C-alpha cells in the first residue's frame, strides 16, 4: 500500500524526496517479476520514463537503472515499458550522455531486445541499430560487451530484422569482435554471427563478404564449448 | 526431474511455467530419444493445452517445443496428433503473430513429412486453406516454411493432391516458380513435380495454371535438383 505514494513522489520538487522514492522504486524493480508487476499496477512506468527527457544526472542514472531492471521482466512487462514510451528516450541516451548512463541504457535495450520479434521491431523503429553498431568500437570494453549482447538479441529476430542490422553496418565490426581480447565479447559476437548465418542466402553472402569464414575457422579450436558449437553452426551455414 | 517439469506446465506462477517450458523445448530439440522421454513422461497433452488460453510468450515456447517433437519419427508424430495438436496449430495460422505463425507452419511441415494417414489428419484439421493463403501475404521466411509443408502434402495420395488443388494451391505455386528467392523456387518446383505425378485431370489443372512455360524456364537452371524436378514435371504434362 506504499507504492502509490512512491509514484506520487516521482513528481516532487524536493530532489531528496524524488531521489529517495526513485531508490525505493529501483530496489523493487530489481526484486523479480512479481515485484515489477507491483510497479506496473501502481502506474510507475509512465512517470519513471518521463524522468529521462528533462531531469538531472543523478535522477537519470537511477531512473535508467530501474528501467533496465523492469526490462528484465516477462514479455508482457517489456510491452508495458514500450507502451510507457521508453524506447525513444533510451535510444536518445546512447550518444551524448555519461558512460554510466550509456551503459545502463544499452543494458535496458538489450533486455527489451530479448522480447518477442514485434518488440525488436519497435527498437528498430526507435532507431536503435545505428547507435548500437557505433558502440561496438567507439566505447569502453564494458559498453562494447553490452552492445554486442543487444545486437545478438536483435539478430535472434526474423530475417527482415537481420536485414536491418546488415544495413546498419553490423557485420564488419561483429567479425572483428570474433578475435576480441575478451572471451565474453567473443561469446556474444559468435552467437550474433550464428544467428545471422541462419538467415537467407543473400545474408549468408554478406557474412562471407565481411570475412566471417577465416574468423570462425580460427574459433573451431576454441576451448569454450558454446563458442565452438556456434562457430561450427555458422561455418556449416556458410558452406552449402 | 521430468515428472516435476510436466507438473509445472499447469503452475499459476508464469516464471515457473516458462522455465519448465524452456527445459521441455531444450529436451524436444535433443533428438528422437529425448522426444521419447517427453512422450513417456506424459508431456504432450499439457503442452498442447497451453496453445488455447495462454499468453503470447507461453504460446511461442510451446509451439517451438511442438515443432521439435514433430521432427521425430512417424510414431512420435502420431503421439502428437493423438494429443490433439493439429486443430490448435492450424488455428494459429489465422490470427497469431508472424513469429508464432512461422513456428506453427514449421510444425505442420514436419507433421506433413509423416505418413499418408498423418497428411490426411492435417487435411481434416483444415490446414490447406490457411497454408495456401500464406503463399501470397506472408513474409519470405513464412513462405519458405509454407511451400515445404505444401510440397510434403503433395507427396501424398491422388485424393490428397486433389484437396490441395481444391484449396487453390496451383496458381500461387506456379507464381513461386519465378520467385526472387532461389530457396522458394526449389521448394515450389518440388511441390509442382509432386502434383505432376497425379492423375490426368490433375495434370490438366497444372496445364491450365500455366505450369508448362514456367517449368520450361527452369530447364536452364544451375541447380541440379531444380532441373530434375522441372524435367520430371514437364514429361508428365507432355506424356
Amino acid at each position: 500500500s506504499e507504492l502509490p505514494q512512491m509514484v506520487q513522489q516521482l513528481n516532487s520538487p524536493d530532489q531528496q524526496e524524488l531521489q529517495s522514492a526513485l531508490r525505493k522504486l529501483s530496489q523493487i524493480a530489481s526484486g523479480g517479476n512479481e515485484q515489477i508487476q507491483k510497479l506496473i499496477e501502481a502506474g510507475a512506468l509512465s512517470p519513471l520514463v518521463k524522468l529521462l527527457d528533462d531531469a538531472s544526472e543523478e535522477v537519470i542514472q537511477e531512473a535508467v537503472w530501474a528501467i533496465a531492471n523492469i526490462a528484465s521482466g516477462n514479455n508482457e512487462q517489456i510491452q508495458k515499458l514500450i507502451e510507457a514510451g521508453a524506447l525513444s528516450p533510451l535510444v536518445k541516451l546512447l550518444d551524448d550522455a555519461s558512460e554510466e548512463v550509456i551503459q545502463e541504457a544499452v543494458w535496458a535495450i538489450a533486455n527489451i531486445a530479448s522480447g518477442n520479434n514485434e518488440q525488436i521491431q519497435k527498437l528498430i523503429e526507435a532507431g536503435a541499430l545505428s547507435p548500437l553498431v557505433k558502440l561496438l568500437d567507439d566505447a569502453s570494453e564494458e559498453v562494447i560487451q553490452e552492445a554486442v549482447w543487444a545486437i545478438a538479441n536483435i539478430a535472434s529476430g526474423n530475417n527482415e530484422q537481420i536485414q536491418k542490422l546488415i544495413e546498419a553496418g553490423a557485420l564488419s565490426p561483429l567479425v572483428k569482435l570474433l578475435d576480441d581480447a575478451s572471451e565474453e565479447v567473443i561469446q556474444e559476437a559468435v552467437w550474433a554471427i550464428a544467428n545471422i548465418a541462419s538467415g537467407n542466402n543473400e545474408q549468408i553472402q554478406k557474412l562471407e563478404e565481411a570475412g566471417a569464414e577465416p574468423a570462425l575457422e580460427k574459433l573451431q579450436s576454441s576451448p569454450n564449448e558454446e563458442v565452438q558449437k556456434n562457430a561450427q553452426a555458422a561455418l556449416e551455414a556458410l558452406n552449402s | 526431474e521430468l515428472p516435476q517439469m510436466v507438473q509445472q506446465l499447469n503452475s499459476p506462477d508464469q516464471q515457473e511455467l516458462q522455465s519448465a517450458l524452456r527445459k521441455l523445448s531444450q529436451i524436444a530439440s535433443g533428438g528422437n530419444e529425448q522426444i521419447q522421454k517427453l512422450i513417456e513422461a506424459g508431456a504432450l497433452s499439457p503442452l498442447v493445452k497451453l496453445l488455447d488460453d495462454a499468453s503470447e510468450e507461453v504460446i511461442q515456447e510451446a509451439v517451438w517445443a511442438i515443432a521439435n517433437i514433430a521432427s521425430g519419427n512417424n510414431e512420435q508424430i502420431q503421439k502428437l496428433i493423438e494429443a490433439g495438436a493439429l486443430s490448435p496449430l492450424v488455428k494459429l495460422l489465422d490470427d497469431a503473430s508472424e513469429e508464432v505463425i512461422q513456428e506453427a507452419v514449421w510444425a505442420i511441415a514436419n507433421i506433413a513429412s509423416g505418413n499418408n494417414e498423418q497428411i490426411q489428419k492435417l487435411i481434416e484439421a483444415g490446414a490447406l486453406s490457411p497454408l495456401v493463403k500464406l503463399l501470397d501475404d506472408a513474409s519470405e521466411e513464412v513462405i519458405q516454411e509454407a511451400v515445404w509443408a505444401i510440397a510434403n502434402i503433395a507427396s501424398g495420395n491422388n485424393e490428397q493432391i486433389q484437396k490441395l488443388i481444391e484449396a487453390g494451391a496451383l496458381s500461387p505455386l506456379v507464381k513461386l516458380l519465378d520467385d526472387a528467392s532461389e530457396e522458394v523456387i526449389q521448394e515450389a518446383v518440388w511441390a509442382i513435380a509432386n502434383i505432376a505425378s497425379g492423375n490426368n485431370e490433375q495434370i490438366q489443372k497444372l496445364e491450365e495454371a500455366g505450369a508448362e512455360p514456367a517449368l520450361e524456364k527452369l530447364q536452364s537452371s544451375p541447380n541440379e535438383e531444380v532441373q530434375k524436378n522441372a524435367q520430371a514435371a514437364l514429361e508428365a504434362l507432355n506424356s
Binding site: 530479448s114 535472434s156 529476430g157 544467428n195 541462419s198 | 530439440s29 517451438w64
Partner: peptide, 6 residues
C-alpha cells in the same frame, strides 16, 4: 531447426 532466441 535452429534456436536463435536465448
Amino acid at each position: 531447426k535452429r534456436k536463435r532466441k536465448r
